[PDB]
DNA sequence: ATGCCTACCACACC
DNA sequence: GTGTGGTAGGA
Ligand SMILES: Nc1ncnc2c1ncn2[C@H]1C[C@H](O)[C@@H](COP(=O)(O)OP(=O)(O)OP(=O)(O)O)O1
Ligand SMILES: [Ca+2]
């Protein structure tokens with residue numbers, strides 16, 4: 001209620017060919033206005049400008065059409081998915097830690113330990129069954145930063161929205177947050193030596209952008225790619241490429257339609 | 269013409 | 283030691 005008000009208060013302050021939808025907007029609110037008026041299943045992507053800052057331009061189109069002009073990786077570099085507020089979404093993680101500050105850290109093993117804990121939490125709290133085979137593991141690491149994105153592919157399950165995902169993780173990670181069951185493997189140090197969590201809990205905000213599979217930040221050149229030890233394999237289909245399957249799986253807001261979907265909620 | 273909002277501190281107040 | 287409130291900085 002107070003979330004919408006500020007959203008529209010800032011909007012006034014800053015105020016035959018084949019079927020193809022490809023609309024750009026300078027403001028995020030305009031893009032979502034178009035989505036509400038479009039009868040097709042279109043979504044909002046955030047595109048970083050040539051400027052060095054985090055200035056974004058917003059694209060609206062379908063997943064199929066976006067992938068058409070995106071897969072070559074010649075154009076549409078540095079793209080982000082906009083996770084809409086109040087939209088059902090998958091369980092996803094942003095994992096980071098500075099390598100110099102953590103010499104003994106084995107990120108590959110912290111990830112495995114994290115997945116096991118989260119899978120146990122989902123079982124005890126929601127009766128949801130899942131394992132590492134249901135977790136799309138993406139990597140964007142460099143010499144200086146260990147970086148991974150995890151996107152859970154739960155069978156006929158989703159969270160009410162990404163805010164509720166955050167509430168779920170803050171709840172089950174409260175032990176680790178106190179260090180700042182034994183969750184100490186999640187504790188890492190940043191460039192200044194301050195103890196932080198291996199799980200970045202700041203990416204569960206309204207309209208959070210989330211770097212797309214095979215995209216990099218405008219400053220760098222390292223793009224998100226399926227990790228070497230990734231264990232989620234989409235069901236192969238003769239009608240779509242494997243890469244498109246991974247793309248769809250990687251989209252946090254692309255909740256597969258199911259006639260028996262369970263929606264998980266979690267309040268603060 | 270990007271969006272979002274927590275960690276942090278200064279200040280009452282008890 | 284609780285309670286707001288007001289802002290700069292990171293994602
Ligand atoms: N300045 C910004 N404005 C808007 N959204 C942002 C901004 N910075 C980051 N985000 C969003 C997009 C990112 O995918 C997400 C997580 O940020 P962050 O972890 O810093 O980068 P990343 O996880 O995409 O790559 P990496 O972690 O490897 O640098 O938050
Ligand atoms: Ca990250």
Ligand SMILES: [Ca+2]
Nearest residue numbers: 094095096200
């Ligand atoms: Ca992060």
